[PDB]
Symmetry: D2
Subunit: 294 residues, 4 copies
Amino acid sequence: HHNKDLKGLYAALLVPFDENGQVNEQGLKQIAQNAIETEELDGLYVNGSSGENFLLNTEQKKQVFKVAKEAVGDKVKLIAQVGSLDLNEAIELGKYATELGYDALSAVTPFYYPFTFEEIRDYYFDIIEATQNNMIIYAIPDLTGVNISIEQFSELFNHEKIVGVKYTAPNFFLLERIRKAFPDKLILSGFDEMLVQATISGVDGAIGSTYNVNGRRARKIFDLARQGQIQEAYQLQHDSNDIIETVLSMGIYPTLKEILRHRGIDAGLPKRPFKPFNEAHRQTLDQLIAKYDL
Amino acid sequence: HHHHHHNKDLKGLYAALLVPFDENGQVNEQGLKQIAQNAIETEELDGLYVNGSSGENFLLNTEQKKQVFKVAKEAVGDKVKLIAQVGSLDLNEAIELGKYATELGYDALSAVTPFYYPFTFEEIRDYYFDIIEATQNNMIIYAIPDLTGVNISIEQFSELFNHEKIVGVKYTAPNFFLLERIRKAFPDKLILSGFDEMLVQATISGVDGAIGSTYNVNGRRARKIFDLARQGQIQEAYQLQHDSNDIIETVLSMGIYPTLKEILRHRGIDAGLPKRPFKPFNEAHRQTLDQLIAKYDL
Amino acid sequence: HNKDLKGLYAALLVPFDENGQVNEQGLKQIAQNAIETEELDGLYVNGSSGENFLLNTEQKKQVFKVAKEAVGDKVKLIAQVGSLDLNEAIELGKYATELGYDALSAVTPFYYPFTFEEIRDYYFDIIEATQNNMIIYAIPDLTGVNISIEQFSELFNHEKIVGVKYTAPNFFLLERIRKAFPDKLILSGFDEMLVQATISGVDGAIGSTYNVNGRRARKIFDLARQGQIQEAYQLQHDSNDIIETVLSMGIYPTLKEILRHRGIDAGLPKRPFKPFNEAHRQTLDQLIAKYDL
Amino acid sequence: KDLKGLYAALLVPFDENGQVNEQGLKQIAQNAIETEELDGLYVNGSSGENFLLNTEQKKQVFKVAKEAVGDKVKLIAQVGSLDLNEAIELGKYATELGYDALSAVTPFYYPFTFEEIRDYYFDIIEATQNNMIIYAIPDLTGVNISIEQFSELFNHEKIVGVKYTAPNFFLLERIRKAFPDKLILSGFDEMLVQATISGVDGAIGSTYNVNGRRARKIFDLARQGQIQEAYQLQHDSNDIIETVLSMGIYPTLKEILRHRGIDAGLPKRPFKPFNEAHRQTLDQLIAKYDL
C-alpha cells in the first residue's frame, strides 16, 4: 500500500540553543546531518517532543522546520510535528511545513484541557482540511494523559489522509489489536527501549530521540528481529537499554546533546526551564561513551 | 519615580475571566469588556484572574494574551484587584507577558506549574525564580495537578515560600489534609482555592479567598458561602453550596466554558464562541440549561 | 427498638502475641479505653484498623465476642464482616447479629475486577442471609474501587442498606451523596479531615486515632456543628500533628504504643506488620508530652 | 525438576454454595495436561478463585490437583495470603504433598513497606524450606516491584524466580539481564510472544486451559526465530482472550471446558455465572478456533 511510504527509522531531531533560548542554527544543521550520515537513519521527525518544541514560539518552530530540510537530501524522509494547543498556529505551521515539501504532518493529541474525543478528532480533521497533507496521529498518553481506543482509531483511520500513528502507549495488547485491525495503516513506535518488542509486533518503523546517538544498533535490532534473529536483536536491546536507562537518569535531552558535543558538534544548551547537563554526571557518562563507542 | 503605588491586599473572591471568540478564534473585545464588567458589577467580585485556564489562555498566541490583559484592565475601576496568569511552556513568552502585565499595573502574577515534560522540581523552582527576577512582581504558584500531572510537597512548598516574592498559592489539589498542613505551616502566605464546588470546605480550612470560572454566574452565592461559613452560619453556607454544586455539576456535564458563556449570552452579553478545538455549546443541552437558569435565577 | 447509629466510633485496634494470636485481655482493655477514657459512642469492630484482613474466621469471632463483652448495653456496636469469601462474610454477619451488634458493614469486594452488579449482590446476599442492617464501607485508597452517584442510588434503594462509611478523599462526591440521601447515615472515616466532613453534614465518624484522640475529635465535631469554626479547625491542626506523626511511624503499631503508655497490654501487631521501631521512641515520647496522650 | 515451561493457572469448578466440585476439578486438571499438553499446573492462583476460598478449600484444591496428574508433571502451589499463619500452614501442607515450588502474591490491601513484604517471603521460606516464586501482580494489588527491590529479594537462594505480570517490557528486559540465572514466568496471556522474545523461561495462564496448544506454538516458534508465524498465532489467541475477557473470564473459560463434556460447574459468588446472552457469540468463537 501507499500508506507505507513513510516506513523506516527516524531521528526525533534534537535542537541546540544559546543562553537566551534561541535556536543555534549551525549546530542544528550538524545534528540533522549526524542523524543521516553518521547514524544512517531514513529520516527526521522535526519539532517533536525531543526538539523541545513545546517550549518554542512560532518563529522558532519555522526556523527548525526550515534548517532541518535545507540540511538533508531529497531522498531523506521528513515528518513535521505541528501539534499545538493553538490550532491557528498548528494550521499555520502545517501550511508552512507542507509548502516546504515535508512528506507528512503529525500532531500530538490536544492536552492540558480535558478535550472530548469529538474535539480531538476535529482538531486533526481541521489541520488536514486546511493543509491537504497526510497526517500521522501522535498518541503519547505518558505526557498528555490522553488514551485512544480501538473504536476511536477506526473513526480516525477512516479519514483517507490519516495515514497512521506514532504509537507510544506502553501496551502491546493494544498494539497487537491495532496492528491486526489496521494492516495497511502506518505504525511507527516511539519507545526506543522496547524497539525489539515493537518490531515483532509488526511496526513499520520507529521514531526516537536516542537514535541520534545509537541509530546504528537500532537498525540492527529492527532488521535482526524481522529476519528472525530474535536473540542477537535482543542482545542489542540490552546494550541499547544500558544507554537509554543511563541517559534518562541524567536528563535525556541535555545528555544526548552532550554525547553529540563529544563528536565535535556544537550542541549548545537546552532551553530553560530545562537545566543544562549536571557535571556531577560527567564521569559516569564518559564511562558510557567509551563502553558503547558513542 | 515618586508615585504612591498602593499595595492592595489580595484577599477575596475572583472570577477566572472567560473570553468570547469569533469564528476564527480571535478575541471579541466588546464581549470581553462586558464579561469583565459582569464579574465586577453584577457578580460583585473583588477581582479578576486574567489569562487563566478558564480564559482559554493556553489556546492563544502571545499577541492575543497581551490583548486580553489590556482589555480586562481598561474595563475595570482602580479598586478592582487584578492577577495576571502568565505561566507558559515558553519561558521567554512568560517573562514577556509578565513584564507586560506588570507594566499595565496588574497587582500580581501567577504561573501554572510547568507541564507536559517531566520537569524536575529544581526546574519548576527556577522557572518561577526566573519570572520573578525578570518582572520584579509578586508571584502566585498556580498548583493544578488535575490538568498538569504535577503535585507539590510540603518540603517543596517551604523552599518556594522562602522566596519573599512568592506571596502565595492558587490551590486545586482535591486534598484537605495537605491544605490543612500548608495552612498551618505558612500562616502569612496567601492561599486562594480553585475548586468552586468545595468553596465551603476551603473557607473553613482558612483560605484567604478563591478563584473560579463559575463565579462569573454564581458570584453572589459564592460570597454568601464565603461570608456565612466565616460568620459561623455553617448550615446556611452549606445549603448555598448544595445549590452551587447543582449549577456546577450541570455546567460541567455540558462543557463548562461554553455553557457559562451561554448563561451570560442570556443576560445580553456578547458571549461569542469558544476557541477551537473547543466545540460550541451543543443545542441539545438547551432545555436542561433553561431549566437551570430558571430554578437558580442566573 | 433499634438505636440511633449517629455518633463517634473507635475503629477498634487489636493486640497480638508473638504468633499473631489475639490477646483477649488487652483487647478488652483497648475496648474499654475507647468507651470510658475516650468517651466515644461506639466501637467499629473487625475493620481495617484491627488488622482484620490478616485474621482467620475463628479469630474474627474472638474479636467480635470480646468487644461486645467489654462494653455496656448503651454502647453502639458496628460489625465489619466484609470478606472476599462470601460464605465467611455470611457466617460472620449472622454470628455478629446473634451477638447483638446494631449493624453490619462490609468492604467493597476487592482484588478481582468485580462488576458493579456483582458488588451489589454481594451486599444484597449478606443482607438476605443475616437480616441485619448494612453499612456500605467504601475505601478507594485500599481497594481501588470507586462508587458513582448512580451506584449509591441502586444500593441505597434497599431499606436495609442504612448508610456508608465514607473514605474517598472527595468533598464534591460527599456533598452529592449528602444532598441525595438525607435519609441515609453518612459516617466519615478520614480522621485528618473530620472538620471538613462535619461541615459537610456527616452523621458521625469512625477512626483509628480516636482510640487515643477521641476527646479532641468530639470537640472538633461539636464545635463545628455549632458554627464555632475557628476553634474546631485549630483542634484539627492539633489532631493532624498527631495523625501525621502516627502515620509516619506505622499507624497501628504506634497507636497501640500510645495506648501502651497508659498501662494497656497492647502487645504486637500481627505479621507481616512489623512492630514499632525503637528509633521512633524519642519523637513519639515528645508527641505524648505535647498533646498529653 | 527444572521449573521451565508452560502452566495452566488451574480453574476450579463450584456448586451453588461455592463448595469445590472434586470430580470436575480432577477433569479440569487432567484437561490441562493431557488435552492441552502443558508441562504443569499453577494451583490456587487468582484464576482458581483462590482468594474467595477458605483454608480447608485451598487444601482440598491442592490435594485433588496433585492426585489428578502424573509424577512427571510440574506443580507450583500459590500459598500467598494476607494471613501469614495461613500462608505458612498452606505452604507446609503443599510441600508435604510434593509441590515442586511455592509462590505467594505480594501482600496487598494495606500499605505494607517493602521491608514488610520482604520478610513475609523470607518467613514463608524459613518455615517451609521449599523454593519460592514471587507472584508480582500490580493490576490486581497496586504493588509494583522496583529493580533494586528485586535484587534484595533474589539475593535469597530459595527465591528461585518470579511470575511477572507488570505490563512493562522495559522493566522485564532489565530484570532478564540483571538475573540471567533466575526463573521468569510471564502471566499475561495476550503478550506471550513479546514475553518469549524478551527471554522468559515459560509462562503461566488461565487461557492456556483452553488454548494451551497455540500457546506452545507461540513459545516454540518465537524462540526458533519463526517470528511471523508466532505473531499470527498471537493474533488468533488474542481474539480468544479478548472475547473471553468481554464475557467474564473465569466463567467463560469454564463454559468452553463444559462444551468438552467436563463438569465445569459455576464460579464462586460474588462472581456471577456465564450470561446466556453471550452464548451465540461464544459458540461462534468455539466453531472458529476449534476450542
